[PDB]
Every structure is written in C-alpha cells, then in structure tokens.
Design a protein around this ligand. Structure first.
Ligand SMILES: [Ca+2]
Ligand SMILES: [Ca+2]
Lengths: 131, 131, 131, 131, 131, 131
C-alpha cells in the first residue's frame, strides 16, 4: 500500500480512465489527485486506516469531484467550481477478522453500487427513496 | 426504488449470491436481509435518502455482516456471533447535479473498491496503511 | 554588474524573447521589468547580493510574472491582473568557493529545472507530488 | 513524479553528468543524492509540493554540494567538509494557472540562470553587486 | 529504501522462510509483518533511520515474534498469544564512515549471532552466563 | 559460556577473520577485544545476561570498532580515533520460551542483517531512510 497512482473508470458510454496521482501523506492519510491542467477542478481521493484502541480497524475512503464551468465577467474568463459531489466509505473490521471475511465483505458492498442493482441505484443515482 | 430483493456477489473462488430480502421501512430507511434459517447471524443492509434543507441530497448505505460459530456449553450447542464487520457509504450530491454526473461519480468510487486497485485494496482488505 | 537589460525565453512553440529593462535598485536590490508603456501587471525580476556577518555571500533572484487580460467595463477597456506566478531562488556560497565551483553549481541547479528532468518538472510544472 | 534518478550537468569544459539517486522520502520531501558512500560528502537534491492553506500551490527545490578534502594516512582516510554551497528555488502558483503558463514561467527563470545572461551571472557566479 | 517485503530464515531442521509484508510506516518507522489473514499475534519487524543533532546517523531494527497456539473455549477455537520474544539492534554510525566500514561492521556483529559462535550463542540462546 | 576467544568475519572481498580475545569480566559483563596493544584502537565486544525482576531473561551484545589514523614522526607514533561505530543487540525472552524457539528467533533477526536482505541493508549500511 505504497502511495501510488489510482485509476478509476467512470460509467460513460465508453468508460474513461480517471488517473489520480499521489500528492501527499498527512497524519497517515494518503491523497491522490486527478488534475486537469488547472489545479482548481482537481478531484481528490483520500484513504486512511487506523487501529482503534478497542481492537478494531477502521478504513476511510473519501472521493471529491467538483464540476467546473467558465464564468465570464466583464470579459474576464475564469474557470470556477459551480458544484461538488462527495462520497465517504467507512469500513470497520474486527481485529479478529480473517482476510477472506474482509475481502468478501468489500466485494459485496462493492457489488451493491453496481448500476443494475436497482434497489440502490435508483437512489444513489436517480434520487429516489424507498417504498 | 421499491423496497425489493437485493442480491450481492462476494469475492469467493466461484462467487456466491447473497440474497437480501426486504424486511421493513422505518422513517424512510429500507432494510433488506440475507437470513440463513436462524435469524441471528442475519446480515442486514440498509439504504436511505433525504433531501437537506440547504439543497442537497444525501444517501446512506450500511452493510452489516456478522459471523456465527457454534458455542458449546455443558452440552448445550448454541449458535453465536463471534465478530461483526460494518461498512457505511455516504453520498452527498448538489441539488443542481445532473444524472450523468452522479452516475459517473458512483461508478468511479465503485471501481475503487475493485480488488485489483492496489492502493485501496491493500488497505480495506489487507489492513495496510499508506506510505 | 551594472543594472542592465535582461532577456528571458519562453518554452512556447517558438520561444519568445522577454526583454526586461531597468526600473530601479532600492536597498541594493536591482529590479528590471518587462512592460508595455503602462506600469501595471508588468513582469518583474529582481536581483541582489549581500555579504553575511558570518562571512558568507548570499544572492537572491526573484521573478514575478502576472497574467494580464482586458477587463471591459461600460466600454472602458482596462488591462488587469488575473493572477500571478512567483519564484525565488536563493544562492548561499562560501567566501572561499572558487569561480568554477560556483559556476558548476548554478549550472546544475539550472539543468534541474528542465523540460525533460522528469522528477523535477512533473512537480514544479504539473504540481504533482513525489512518491 | 515517482522518486527516481535525476542527472544534472556541469558547466565544466566537457559537461560532467552528476547522477543523483533516490535516498528517500520524508514528510513529503523527496531526496536524491550524488553519493560516494560517506554521507557528509553527499551532494543532495530536495523537492516538495504543498497546497497552501489559502489555495496556492508551492513547490520547493533545494540543492547542496559540499566540497570535501580527504586526507589519507597509512591507508586511513579522514574526510572533512571544507565549504558548502546551497540553493533554494521557491515556486508559488495560482490555483487558476494554466499548465502552459507555469511551464513558461519555469523556463523563463530557468533561462535567467545562465552563462551569457550577464546581469544575473556576474552576481550569482562572480559575486559582484548591482549598481 | 522503499518499504517492501522481507524474508527471514529459521534455524529449523530445514530452514523455513518467514515472509514479512509491509503494514505501514509511522513517524518514519517502517513496519513489515508476517501474518495469516488475522491481525493477531503476527510477528513484526520494524526498521528506522534518523540523523542526530550531533551529526550522527543512527538506525534501529526491532523484531518481535509472538508464539500463538489455539485456545479452545466452549468449542470456540481462537488463536492466542502465549508468549513473545523481543530483540532490538541499534546501529550508530559516524557521518564520515565509508560504505565499506559500515558494511564490514554489520557483517561482524552479524557473524557474532551464530550457531557456532560459542561465547555468544550459549548466552543469547541458552541463557547461560559468562565466566 | 566461559569467556573465550570470539572470531568475527568481514564482508571484505575475501572475508578477514577478526579475532577478539578475552580482556575481562566486570559486573557480569564479558569483554572480548581485537586489540593491537593501544587501548583506543581496540575494537571491543561486550556480552551480558540478566534475569529481569519481573521474570524475563535479557542478554545484551555490544560491538564497537574505532577507526584510527596513526601519524608517525621521526619514529614516534600518534594514534587518533577519527570516528567510531557502535551496535547494541538487545534480546528479551519469556521465562517459558523453548530453547528451539529462542534459537529460531536469533537466527531470524540474524538473517535480517545481510547483504541481500534489501529493505534492511539499504538502511543499516547505505543509510537510506524508509519510504
Ligand atoms: Ca413497496
Ligand atoms: Ca512512498
């Protein structure tokens, strides 16, 4: 788990590769960043792990992806952030857990984000509730 | 997004299907449950969406998967929970976001959980930190 | 030597020459600027040299390049500074260094700032971290 | 920018290649070294990147080359640093800067350090003041 | 260099390879561990290097090998630590030492820990005094 | 373990045998020396064993080899320690440890110090940090 590049595919027609390049490590918190030429609409992805005192392990993923549009004022073109989207995955394993257990766990909740899993998709994508 | 069945694949040799069946809806919070015959090691998955007052949408996914082993006491065999694993995904979109934006977003962070994405896997699965 | 002109090159397709002319030297800090007739948003380059109490020679270079665009207000077109880029090299030599050592030194640090010097460029130009 | 070899040239008659090799990364600071084995004789190159609190991007280069005469006696060597030279380039960009802009900036100040660029040379190499 | 794998050998009939993998590096203290999927009673090996204010290089190695056996409680088999063995080598070199000196040094101290090196073995292994 | 000769090898092209001979025992600390006659030039190996108050068993090794250039003038020699190197291995076992266990422990950390074991070598010999 050496801070390194992280590539994430999106759900575009023909999936694009978003390449997040490491930036730094503060307080045992890695940060990788997909940056376009201008470092303002840069999307950041952080990751961290810490072992609790009560014998547990807690991982924390954060992904931030802002949207930029060019705002024109008195002829002055300036790229700005019009809105941002945030997500935060939080794991909590028991210090006594086995690798397989953890793997399967991830795998499952991962498979839940899938686009065909209607129950969740119709919520985290199309903003519907449950009924 | 009608409360309904939710099937999640795990990362086993030849992936197993875990079928969570709806249980109820409390305060606009759905709950589906993969239950073995005995309702004690039942794994629960909850989902919810709420529109903030400040014009945002926040989804919240929770997956809980306990592990059960048979504890024998004075000849009395009893299945019990020896440890549990928890995860909590939290989305936060801007009320002005477009479907595509949201979709891609999900898709990306989803693709991050993937098993081959070393940066995160070596952390949320093998409990390594970053360096 | 005497405060005189200073020409710096671009990294533009066909490198443009930026001609800086003397402006003034205050407190033994030479300033030379590249500007059109107007004293606004002119790119400035300052140079200085001082001997330290501890017996060291220490000189300083500072280049400042503001980006100016035309801001139209009620038909009143005025050029204005949209943003600026700063850099400050600091040389500190030993009073016993030979011309060659010093020259070679500069030459190196110089070479380091370069289109192809990967390690460096990717950071001072692409603002990407080291890992 | 993964920590890797960085090679800088002299201004020696027939430019000598100084190959610095990665030593390590510490608190988000890369270090590459042109070493011989003994640490005090090591010429070291440093590099870092930070996103300032107030939204700017700064990166820092630092080169150090010590001069060291090694007295030999009956086969036993005694290295001694007799003088050292230091440089510290400090870039500071605006979060709205273009890749192109930055690049050009660098290239300009780069061009400033240079045998023929008189104004500068006579000072950062010949240690003459400005008048 | 970079925190990577580390394999250590037994002194068992047919020496077994103990493969330690990276876990994390906190406060510039690399840790690499040999463990099964579970984070308990894993043998840990840490390594670090620091430069002293007085101008010395000092690195530290620490190997910890807990002995784990299966503790059956009411049919609930759990692996647990019965006892642990600790060791801490401390190297302190002079900033003017040459690669050879240092290497040779290690090699010696190394040789000292050895099956046949009587004086030493009988004490660090048989816990018998010197007389 | 009766205080006796201890011979350690180099990592020199053709391994040189360093024969330390017993000097003495002081307050339960054995000392063996590779001497030439003059005490400051002596490379000395220390060794001890204690049963900690709280029932543990600790033994300690310490090796020291000074580098000393001896200036000769008209037949009169002037030795001078120009730099020294120190190591301190610290074992700590459990009163319930097996001979076998201990032995293996030693052999493992022993194996750690070693030309090919990269992670370690690059640090305890090449003085590189961990990243
Ligand atoms: Ca319904
Ligand atoms: Ca790293």
């Amino acid at each position: 788990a050496q801070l390194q590049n992280l590539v994430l595919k999106d759900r575009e027609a023909t999936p694009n590769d978003h390449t997040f390049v490491p930036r730094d490590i503060r307080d045992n918190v890695g940060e990788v960043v997909e940056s376009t030429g201008v470092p303002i609409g840069e999307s950041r992805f952080t990751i961290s792990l810490r072992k609790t005192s009560n014998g547990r392990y807690k991982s924390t993923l954060k992904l931030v992806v802002p949207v930029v549009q060019s705002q024109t004022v008195n002829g002055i073109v300036t790229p700005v952030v019009v809105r941002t989207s945030y997500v935060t995955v939080d794991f909590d394993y028991d210090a006594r857990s086995t690798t397989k257990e953890r793997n399967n766990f991830v795998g499952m909740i991962a498979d839940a984000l899938k686009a065909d899993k209607m129950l969740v998709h119709d919520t985290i994508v199309n903003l519907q509730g449950v009924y």
